[PDB]
Design a protein around this motif. Structure first.
Motif, PDB file in Angstrom:
ATOM      1  N   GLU A 119      38.213  46.866  32.177  1.00 14.86           N
ATOM      2  CA  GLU A 119      38.611  47.202  33.537  1.00 14.86           C
ATOM      3  C   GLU A 119      38.618  45.964  34.428  1.00 14.86           C
ATOM      4  N   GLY A 123      41.898  44.303  36.134  1.00 15.93           N
ATOM      5  CA  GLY A 123      41.857  44.286  37.584  1.00 15.93           C
ATOM      6  C   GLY A 123      42.387  42.983  38.140  1.00 15.93           C
ATOM      7  N   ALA A 127      45.980  42.551  40.139  1.00 13.13           N
ATOM      8  CA  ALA A 127      45.874  41.940  41.459  1.00 13.13           C
ATOM      9  C   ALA A 127      46.891  40.815  41.608  1.00 13.13           C
TER      10      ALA A 127
ATOM     11  N   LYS B   1      51.234  40.846  53.747  1.00 18.07           N
ATOM     12  CA  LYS B   1      51.089  42.162  53.133  1.00 18.07           C
ATOM     13  C   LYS B   1      49.643  42.644  53.154  1.00 18.07           C
ATOM     14  N   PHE B   3      46.688  45.316  51.796  1.00 21.09           N
ATOM     15  CA  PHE B   3      46.330  46.081  50.609  1.00 21.09           C
ATOM     16  C   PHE B   3      45.109  46.958  50.855  1.00 21.09           C
ATOM     17  N   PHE B  11      37.337  48.589  37.754  1.00 19.51           N
ATOM     18  CA  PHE B  11      38.746  48.248  37.886  1.00 19.51           C
ATOM     19  C   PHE B  11      39.120  47.928  39.333  1.00 19.51           C
ATOM     20  N   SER B  14      37.343  44.831  40.976  1.00 23.09           N
ATOM     21  CA  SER B  14      37.882  43.566  40.493  1.00 23.09           C
ATOM     22  C   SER B  14      39.196  43.245  41.196  1.00 23.09           C
ATOM     23  N   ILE B  15      40.044  44.259  41.347  1.00 23.53           N
ATOM     24  CA  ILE B  15      41.289  44.121  42.097  1.00 23.53           C
ATOM     25  C   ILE B  15      41.023  43.642  43.520  1.00 23.53           C
ATOM     26  N   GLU B  18      39.485  40.079  43.678  1.00 24.41           N
ATOM     27  CA  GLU B  18      40.463  39.068  43.297  1.00 24.41           C
ATOM     28  C   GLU B  18      41.515  38.896  44.391  1.00 24.41           C
ATOM     29  N   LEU B  19      41.959  40.011  44.968  1.00 28.65           N
ATOM     30  CA  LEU B  19      42.910  39.977  46.076  1.00 28.65           C
ATOM     31  C   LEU B  19      42.320  39.242  47.276  1.00 28.65           C
ATOM     32  N   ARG B  21      39.965  36.939  47.186  1.00 28.23           N
ATOM     33  CA  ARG B  21      39.849  35.527  46.843  1.00 28.23           C
ATOM     34  C   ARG B  21      41.151  34.788  47.144  1.00 28.23           C
ATOM     35  N   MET B  22      42.277  35.477  46.981  1.00 30.47           N
ATOM     36  CA  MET B  22      43.581  34.884  47.268  1.00 30.47           C
ATOM     37  C   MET B  22      43.876  34.863  48.768  1.00 30.47           C
ATOM     38  N   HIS B  24      43.977  37.729  51.017  1.00 30.82           N
ATOM     39  CA  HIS B  24      44.789  38.843  51.494  1.00 30.82           C
ATOM     40  C   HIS B  24      43.933  39.813  52.301  1.00 30.82           C
ATOM     41  N   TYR B  67      50.546  48.586  50.281  1.00 33.97           N
ATOM     42  CA  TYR B  67      50.034  48.923  48.959  1.00 33.97           C
ATOM     43  C   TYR B  67      48.686  49.628  49.042  1.00 33.97           C
ATOM     44  N   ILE B  69      45.879  51.255  46.381  1.00 35.60           N
ATOM     45  CA  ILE B  69      45.501  51.389  44.980  1.00 35.60           C
ATOM     46  C   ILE B  69      44.418  52.446  44.800  1.00 35.60           C
ATOM     47  N   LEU B  85      48.083  62.914  48.744  1.00 41.62           N
ATOM     48  CA  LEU B  85      47.992  62.683  50.185  1.00 41.62           C
ATOM     49  C   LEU B  85      48.792  61.464  50.633  1.00 41.62           C
ATOM     50  N   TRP B  95      49.738  52.716  43.574  1.00 44.23           N
ATOM     51  CA  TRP B  95      49.341  52.413  42.202  1.00 44.23           C
ATOM     52  C   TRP B  95      48.060  53.166  41.850  1.00 44.23           C
ATOM     53  N   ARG B 114      53.302  53.373  40.458  1.00 40.01           N
ATOM     54  CA  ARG B 114      52.864  52.692  39.244  1.00 40.01           C
ATOM     55  C   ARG B 114      51.604  53.333  38.670  1.00 40.01           C
TER      56      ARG B 114
END
Ligand SMILES: Nc1ncnc2c1ncn2[C@@H]1O[C@H](COP(=O)(O)OP(=O)(O)O)[C@@H](O)[C@H]1O
Ligand SMILES: Nc1ncnc2c1ncn2[C@@H]1O[C@H](COP(=O)(O)OP(=O)(O)O)[C@@H](O)[C@H]1O
Ligand SMILES: Nc1ncnc2c1ncn2[C@@H]1O[C@H](COP(=O)(O)OP(=O)(O)O)[C@@H](O)[C@H]1O
Ligand SMILES: Nc1ncnc2c1ncn2[C@@H]1O[C@H](COP(=O)(O)OP(=O)(O)O)[C@@H](O)[C@H]1O
Ligand SMILES: Nc1ncnc2c1ncn2[C@@H]1O[C@H](COP(=O)(O)OP(=O)(O)O)[C@@H](O)[C@H]1O
Ligand SMILES: Nc1ncnc2c1ncn2[C@@H]1O[C@H](COP(=O)(O)OP(=O)(O)O)[C@@H](O)[C@H]1O
Ligand SMILES: Nc1ncnc2c1ncn2[C@@H]1O[C@H](COP(=O)(O)OP(=O)(O)O)[C@@H](O)[C@H]1O
Ligand SMILES: Nc1ncnc2c1ncn2[C@@H]1O[C@H](COP(=O)(O)OP(=O)(O)O)[C@@H](O)[C@H]1O
Lengths: 216, 216, 216, 216, 216, 216, 216, 216
Positions: A119, A123, A127, B1, B3, B11, B14-15, B18-19, B21-22, B24, B67, B69, B85, B95, B114
Motif C-alpha cells: 500500500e 501510494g 501520488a 491543483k 487534493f 495507502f 502515503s499518497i 508524498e503529495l 512533500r511535492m 501541493h 481531486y 481520493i 456522495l 479515485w 479511477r
C-alpha cells in the motif's frame, strides 16, 4: 523453485495466482476454509492451516520450500509468530508483508529476508500520477535520472521526433511510442506522435519536467 | 491543483504524505481522531470527519477540490457511499481504492473515475521478482514489451555491450548501466559491465527472458 | 539493585510505586507526559521517552539496570520491539506484561526472561474467593495442598485450638490467629478464636474444605 | 449458587474458566461473538449480549444468579451502566473490575459489592518478587508478619532443619518443603533440604529477610 | 455566569429560551440536528453533540460553563452518563431532570447538585387547582403555610377588607387585589373587592381553606 | 366532584395520586396494565382502557365525570383524538397536556377547556432560579409585580427588618422569615434575619432586584 | 376550477405537476423556499408560506379555491392544524394526505372531505404484482370483481379468443388486446393473441387467477 | 414463493399485510421494535434487524427469499446500502422504494430489479380524480384509450343502456354497472342505470369525456 504463500488475501492471493500463471509450483496456505477453496484452482495445492502452529506448519513439509511469503494481514502478532517459526525451520527466503513501521522493525530484527509495503509503495506512485496528470508510469534509475511513460497531449499531436528536439532542447531521449496499442521501440526521427499516445522519455528528472511544461 | 485524501491508512496516508512533500495543497480526512493527529505535519489541513455524512463533507469545502481520493479500506460501505456522495457534488476526479472484484464493479457503475488495486498490483510485481531473482524492478510498456532492471551475474562480468549482441540476437536495447552508484546512460557498444551492477534492458518480454537464460 | 519500569499503567505503575516504597532505585519511563508527571513523586527519576526508539533508550542509560520491566499494554507492537531492543542491549533481566496467548509466544521467543499475566492470575484467585466467600487469601503449595486464611464465623466463636482438633480429625494445622489487628503465630492449644478474626489453616485442599463445612 | 461473568476478557475469561473447572454453573456473557465462541468450551452457557441493555439482561434470566462479575475493561461507561442495572435488579453480589480511581469511586457510590484492581494488586506482588528473587509466592498475615514460599539456594543444599535452626536464631518456623513435586508438610527436624526446592517459612518480615541474607 | 443546556426538549428548551431572554450566555446542546436548528434563534450558540461522549463534550468547551442543565428525558441511561461526565469534569453546578423515583436516587449518588421533577411538581400544583376552582396560583412557604391567589366570588363582591377580618378571624393577611388589570399592593382596610378579581391571601393552609369555606 | 385521569404518566399520575390524598373520587385510566396496577392503591378506581376507543370510553361511564384530564404524552394523535372524542360526549371540563405549540393550537380549536404545559412552565421557573441563585421560589401578581422567596446571604447576617428598610429604600415589603424550618409570618421590625434563612419579599420586580444587588 | 396544493412533496408535487399539465389553475404552496423554486415552472403561482398560520393563509386568498390539497407529510401536527384552519374558512373541498390510522381518524372528525393513503394503496397494488408476475396493472370494481392487464406468455402464443373460451369456462371476458403498440378494443372471437402482448381480462378475482394458472 | 419486506412503514407495511392476507410466506423486517411488534400479527415472521448490516441480514436467512422489498423510509443511504447488499447476495428480485429522481438513478445503476414511486404515481391518479369529479378510478390502456369508473349523476338517473346509445354515439362500451354494491358484468341493453351508481365505460379518452359532458 518452490513457493509457499501463507495468507491468501489481496496481496498474498495475487502473488499466488500470478506465480501459478507463470507455471511455478505454488503452495497456498490459509486458515480460512473459504479462502483455500477459492484459490484451489489457482494453486498447485491449497491447504487449510494455522501458520502460528508449528505442528501444522511441519505437517505441510514447509522445510521443502525455498521461498515462503507471509501475507497475513490483520493479525500482526500472527504474522510475527509465523516469521519466527519459519526462521527456526531454516527457510532460505522469508518474505513478509508489513503493516506499519513498528511491524517492519520487529520483522527486520527477527530475520525477515525481505519486507514489503504494498500500500505504501503504490501510494507513492499514484501520488506521482496525481501531481502530474501526464505521467502514466515510471522507473527511477537514480536520484537524478529517470525513465517516464507519458500520456501525449494535444500540443504533441502530429509532431515528429525530429520536430520535438528533445536531446538538444532538453537533453533527453525518446525511447518508445505507443499508438492504438501497437508499440514502436527506438523510434526514428521521422516518426510522428499523435494525441493519447504513450511516450517513453529518458533523461534527467528536471529535464523531463521542463519538456512537460514547455513541450506538452 | 488541490487534493483531498479521504482515509489516512497505509495507502491514503502515503499518497497524502508524498503529495505534501511535492508541495501541493492536501486535505487529510479521517474519521479516527488518532489517524488525523498523526498526519498533521504531512498535510496542509487535517480534519476529523465522516465522509459518509453529506453535511460534514461540505464543512470541509470539498467542492473546491479537483481531486478527491477515497482510500477507505476495510469498510466497503463507507467507500461506496463516499464515492457516491462525491459524484453528486460534481467532483472532477474521484479515485477510489478497491477491496475486491465486486467492489470494483459497484465503483465502476456509480461513476468512479479511477479504481486502484494496490495490494493486487504489487502482488503481481513481487511475483515477477520471486520467479526471477535477476529482476530488481520493471515497467510494462504494453502486454508484449517492457523495460527491465537486471542484476548482473558473474556470467556477465567483463562482457562488452557488443559482446552481448542484444540489438540483433535478442532484438532488445540496453538503456543504462549502474556501476558503484555511478550512472551511465545510453551506453556505447564499447562500454564494459561488471557483476552485481544494475542493467536496464528494453524490449519484448520473451526476448529479455531469452537473454536471461542464455546470456546471464 | 537498579530497576527500570517502562510503561506507567495500572500494572507498571503499581510495580514502580511499590518498589519505590521499599527504597529501591526505580526509573519510571513513559511516553505520556501526564503519566510521567503523576509518578514524579513515586520514582527516583521520571523520564518522558519512547521505548521503541533506540537512541532515546541509550539516552536513559538503560544498559546499567539489572531489571527492566516492559509494562506497555495496548500497543503489543511497542512491547515486542522494546523487549527486542532491550535484549540486544544485553539487559540481565527483562520482565514483560503479555496481552494475549500470541503475545506470550513472541516474547518467549525473543528472549523475555519472565512473562506476566496479571489479569489471568487474579482471575484465578478471585474465582477461588467467589466459590468460597470465607477464604480471604491463600497460597498453593501444590495441586493438592494449600495454606488458607479464613474469616471466622459464629460457629468458631470462643473456640479453642484443642477444641477444634484439626491436626488429627482433619489432618490440618492452624498456623496463626489475627485478633483486632493483633497477631499470634504458632498458637498454643489453649489459645482462643473469636468471630470475625483471621484464621490461617494448613493442609490438604479437600481436608480444609471439610473443616469449613463441618467445623465452621 | 450460580455465577454470571459479564465481559470475557483476560480477567473475566480467567474467572469463568477457573470457576468452570471447579464444577460451578457459570454463565459466560460477552458482546463480541468471537469471545463467546472461545469460551463456549469453558462455560456452562455462553450468550452474545449487551449488558447495558435491560431487555437483553432479562432474556438471560440474570436475576437468578447470586454472583455477577462485571469484567468489562476498556469501556468504563458500559461497566458503570451495567453495574447500575444489576443493582436495579436486586442482584445479591456484584463484583466489578475497575479501570481507574474515579471508576472505583462511582462503583462504590452506585453500590458495587466488591471492587477489584487486578493489575494494581499484581503490581505489588511482582514488585516483591522483583526486589527478592528468592520469593516465589507469599501471603501477609499483618503489616509485620508473613508466610513466604522461597526458592532454595545452594547455600541451603543438603541442609537439615535442625541445622538451620530458624525457630530460635531467627524466630521463624519452617512449614513445608517441596521436593521433586512431592510435598512435605510440618517437616520433622531430621528432614533435609536440597537446592531448587520450595521452602515455606513463617515469621516476622524483617526476620525472614535476615534468614535470606544470612542463611541462604 | 455561563449556562449550558443539554437536551432541547419541552423542559430544557424552555430553560434555554427563557435564560436567553434575560440576556445570559446559553449554549444549546442536543443530539438531534432538527432540535439544534430550532433553538439557534433562541440561544447564544447551538451545537449538535452527543453528551455521553467525553470528546464531544470537551469540544464544546463545557469546562467553561458554571451551570450545566441535563434535560435529557426518555433515555435514563443517557441522563446518567452525561451527569457522570460532568461531575468527572468538575462542573460547578449540575441540574438534572429526573424521570422517576429511582432515577432520582442514582443522580443523587453520582453527585447531581439539583434534581428536578417538572411533571411531578406541576401535577400537584394543577391538582390543587382541580380540587379548588377558586385557586388560580399559589406558593408554599413551608409544609404548613402558603400564599394563594384567588378568583373573587360573588360572595365577596363589594366587600371591604375590614369587613373580611382575615387578620383576626382567620389569622391570614390579604396581600394584594387585582381588578381589571390594575393592581393594588398591601391594600388598606378601606379598600374594596369586586367579584372575579384576583385576591392574594397569606397564612396557614388550614386557615385559608376556612376563609374559602366560610368566607368565600 | 368526580375526577377521571386518562394517561398515568409522570404528569397524569401525579395529579391522580395527589387528588387521592385530598379525598376525591378519582378514576385512573391507562392503556398499560402495569401503570394501572401501580396506581390501584392511589386511585378510587383503576381501569385498563384505550382512550382512543369510543366503546371503551363509554364503558368507563366517562360521561359521569365533571373533570377529565388527558395526560397522554408521546402519542400526540392519541391526545388529540381522545380530547376530540370527549368533547363530542359533552364532558364538562377537559384538561389536556400539550406537547408543542402546534398541539396547543389544535386542542384550542377542537375545544379543550384548559391546556397545560408542565415542562414549559417549570422551565421558566427553574431558569429564574438559575439566573438568580438567591431566589428559591416566586409568584407573579402581574407583569410588573411579584412575590419572591429569597435565600439570605452573609451580607444579611444578623440584620434586622428595620435595618433593611426595604419599605422605604426599595418600596418593597417583607412578608415572612423561615429559620431552620421554623416559620414567621408578617414579621415585626425587631425580628432578625440570619444567612441560610428563607426571606419572602413583595413588590415591583425591578425593585426587588435592586435590593438583591445592593442589600444582599 | 381552481386548485390549491399545500405541501410540495412527492405526493403534493406530483398532484401539482400533473394538474398543471392538464391546464388547470394550480397554486403551489410550501414552507420551504427550495421547494417553491423547484415548482415555479410547474405552477400557475408558487408561494412560500406556512400553512399553519392563519394570517398567511388569508394572504394567499385560499378561500377562493374550490379544492385545497393538504399534502404535508412528516409534520402530522401541521397537517391537522392546516386542515382544521381550512374548514374555518368554509373551503368546499379539503383533501388531506394521512400519515397513520390515528391521523385518519382526527381528519375524519374535523371534517376532511377526502382522506388519501398513497403508500398504503400502492402497497396493496405492488403486492398483487409481487404475487403474480403476469399482472401489469388492474382496477377493482368491487371486493370480488376486477379488471386485469396481463403479460402474455408462450402458452397463449397464436391463440384465438374462441380458442380460449373464458366467457363460459371461467366466466371471464376479454376486453382488449395490445400488439406492438397497436391497440384493439372489444376484439372479435376470431382475433389472435401473441406472447409479450398486453391482455385485458374482466371477471371474478379468483376466476382470473384460475385462468392464469391453467390458461397461461 | 417467499417474500421479505424490509422497512415496515406505510408502504412496506401495506405490502406485507396484503401479501400475508393472500396466504404468502412473508418476513417482516424493521429496526424499530414497535414496528416489528405491530406487524407481528400481520406477518409469517417478524424480526428486528438492521438491513445495512450483512451479518444481521445473513442471520435472517435472507438468501432463501425470492423477493426482497426495500421500503427503508428516508435514509437514501440505508435504502442504497441495503439494496447493494442484496445484489451482492444474488437475490433474485430486488424491488426498492425510491425517494427522489436521484435515488432512482443510483438504484438503477446498482441493480434494483424494480423501482417504485408510490406517492408520485398516486399523485397522478388523484390529480385525474380532482380534475374530473365523476371519475372514481381508472386504468389506462394507452395514451388515448382507457377504462373508466364513473359516479352516475342525476342526468343518468333511470336511463337504460340502449337509451344511452354509447354503443354508436361515442364509440364507447359500458362494461359494468354497480348497484348498491351488487355488480353486473357485460350488462344487457335493457339494464337501467340509477344515480350514484358506479359506471364502467370503455373507449377513447376524449369520447368518454364528451359522454360525461353531454350524457351526464
Ligand atoms: N494464523 C493464520 N494462518 C494462516 N492464514 C491466516 C492466519 N491469519 C490470517 N490468515 C489469512 O491472511 C489473510 C488476511 O489478509 P488481509 O487481512 O486480507 O490482508 P491483505 O488484504 O492486505 O492481503 C486471510 O486470507 C486469512 O485467511
Ligand atoms: N466514514 C468514514 N469517513 C472517513 N474516514 C473513514 C470512514 N470510515 C473509515 N475511515 C478511515 O479510513 C481508514 C482506512 O484505512 P485502512 O483500511 O487501514 O487502509 P489500508 O486498507 O490501505 O491499510 C481508517 O483509518 C478509518 O479511520
Ligand atoms: N513507546 C512507548 N514507550 C514508553 N511507554 C509507552 C509507549 N507506548 C505506551 N507507553 C505507556 O504504556 C502505558 C500502558 O499502560 P496501560 O496499558 O494503560 O496499563 P497496563 O498495561 O498496566 O494495564 C501507557 O501509560 C503509556 O504511556
Ligand atoms: N456493553 C457490553 N456488553 C457486554 N460485554 C461487553 C460490553 N462492552 C465490552 N464488553 C466486553 O468486555 C470485554 C473486555 O475485555 P478486555 O478489556 O479485553 O479484558 P481486560 O478487561 O482484562 O483488559 C470484551 O471481551 C468485550 O466483549
Ligand atoms: N446523548 C445525547 N446527547 C445530547 N442530547 C441528547 C442525547 N440523548 C438525548 N438527547 C436529547 O434530549 C432530549 C430529550 O427531550 P425529551 O425526552 O423530549 O424531554 P422533555 O419530555 O423534557 O421534552 C431530546 O431532544 C434529545 O435530542
Ligand atoms: N390510547 C391511550 N389510552 C389510555 N392511556 C394511554 C393511551 N396511550 C398512552 N396512554 C398512557 O398515557 C401515559 C402517557 O404518559 P407519558 O408518555 O409518560 O407522559 P408524561 O410522563 O409526561 O405524563 C402512559 O402511561 C401511557 O400508558
Ligand atoms: N407548515 C408547512 N407549511 C407548508 N408546507 C409544509 C409545512 N410543513 C411541511 N411542508 C412541506 O410539505 C412537504 C412534505 O413532503 P415530504 O414529507 O417530504 O414527502 P411526502 O409528500 O411523501 O410526505 C415538504 O416538502 C415541506 O416543504
Ligand atoms: N436498517 C433498517 N432495517 C430495517 N428497517 C428499517 C431500517 N431503517 C429504517 N427502517 C424502517 O423503514 C420504515 C419505513 O419508513 P417510512 O418513512 O414509514 O416509509 P414508508 O412510509 O414509505 O413505508 C421505518 O418504519 C423504519 O423503521
Amino acid at each position: 523453485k518452490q513457493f509457499a504463500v501463507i495468507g491468501l488475501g489481496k496481496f498474498g492471493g495475487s502473488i499466488c495466482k500470478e506465480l501459478h500463471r507463470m507455471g511455478h509450483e505454488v503452495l497456498a496456505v490459509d486458515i480460512n476454509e473459504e479462502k483455500v477453496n477459492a484459490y484451489a484452482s489457482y494453486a498447485t495445492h491449497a491447504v487449510i492451516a494455522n501458520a502460528t502452529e508449528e505442528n501444522e506448519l511441519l505437517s505441510l513439509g514447509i522445510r521443502n520450500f525455498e521461498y515462503v511469503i507471509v501475507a497475513i494481514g490483520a493479525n500482526i502478532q500472527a504474522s510475527t509468530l509465523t516469521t519466527l517459526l519459519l526462521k527456526e525451520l531454516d527457510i532460505p527466503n522469508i518474505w513478509v508483508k508489513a503493516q506499519n513501521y513498528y511491524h517492519h522493525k520487529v520483522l527486520e530484527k527477527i530475520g525477515a529476508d525481505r519486507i514489503i509495503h504494498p500500500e505504501k509503495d503504490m501510494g507513492v506512485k499514484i501520488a506521482q500520477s496525481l501531481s502530474d496528470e501526464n505521467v502514466l508510469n515510471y522507473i527511477d534509475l537514480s536520484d537524478e535520472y529517470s525513465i517516464v511513460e507519458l500520456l501525449a497531449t494535444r500540443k504533441l499531436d502530429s509532431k515528429s521526433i525530429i520536430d520535438l528536439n528533445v536531446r538538444a532542447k532538453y537533453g533527453c531521449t525518446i525511447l518508445a511510442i505507443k499508438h492504438h496499442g501497437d508499440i514502436c521501440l527506438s523510434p526514428a526521427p521521422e516518426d510522428i506522435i499523435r494525441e493519447q499516445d504513450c511516450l517513453v522519455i529518458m533523461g534527467h528528472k528536471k529535464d523531463i519536467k521542463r519538456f512537460e511544461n514547455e513541450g506538452m
